[PDB]
């Protein structure tokens, strides 16, 4: 669920990091249309596509097994759809970390008017 995704993000990037993704670009957080603006925004777009392929359960409510092992996120012994959801979150948190130094504060809290491009396809 998002509680766990937040723990992955803060565990990988540092305390309070999750709040930087509440609304960023066209896809991180409260967006969902247009073209990803940069690498961080693409991490979010891919994460949305990943959740969209999950069948069998609800990514927002599903509680999966995972843990950090020596700084690395490891999805645990999950069955079916839980495996998939955990993997979506793991990949996205690592993606946010990989691209942390390209985070553009000017992309926070964008209005939908900045995302009026033909929405990209998964």
């Amino acid at each position: 669920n998002l509680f766990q995704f937040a723990k992955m993000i803060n565990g990988k990037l540092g305390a309070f990091s999750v709040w930087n993704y509440i609304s960023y670009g066209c896809y991180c957080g409260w967006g969902g249309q247009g073209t990803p603006k940069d690498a961080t925004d693409r991490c979010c777009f891919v994460h949305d596509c990943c959740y969209g392929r999950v069948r069998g359960c609800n990514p927002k409510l599903a509680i999966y097994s995972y843990s950090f092992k020596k700084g690395n996120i490891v999805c645990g012994k999950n069955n079916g759809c839980l495996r998939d959801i955990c993997e979506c979150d793991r990949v996205a948190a690592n993606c946010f970390h990989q691209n942390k130094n390209t985070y553009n504060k000017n992309y926070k809290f964008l209005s939908s008017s900045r995302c009026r491009q033909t929405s990209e396809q998964c």
Partner: protein, 122 residues
């Protein structure tokens, strides 16, 4: 999509979702576990269950057609999944609007260190 749900929230509650509901309680924000803290939070959990019944599209990126008329939110899509997502968002925005009288800012950023009770179930 969430830009659109944010617009419905603006119309019904007067608040900017990305600075309010987006970080609220155990279900409006990055939670999905624990107890819904109040009526506002319960609206979000109910929305999560409504979204859980949507599989053909991802509610986050389903860009639907809607309008405001006669004090209602009218979902006008012909595409079945876009219509379904719009109906989930309409019900949630209306619910949030009915409960802003008990909106408690103390539940903002709450998920980080709470939401450990027995979780809500659909």
């Amino acid at each position: 999509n969430l830009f659109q749900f944010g617009d419905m929230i603006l119309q019904k509650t007067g608040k900017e979702a990305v600075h309010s509901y987006a970080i609220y309680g155990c279900y409006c924000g990055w939670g999905g576990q624990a107890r819904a803290q109040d009526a506002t939070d319960r609206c979000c959990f109910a929305q999560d269950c409504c979204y859980g019944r949507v599989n053909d599209c991802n509610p986050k990126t389903a860009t639907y057609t809607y309008s405001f008329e006669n004090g209602d939110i009218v979902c006008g899509d012909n595409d079945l999944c876009l219509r379904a997502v719009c109906e989930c968002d309409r019900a949630a925005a209306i619910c949030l609007g009915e409960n802003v009288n008990t909106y408690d800012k103390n539940y903002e950023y709450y998920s980080i260190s709470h939401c450990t009770e027995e979780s809500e179930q659909c």
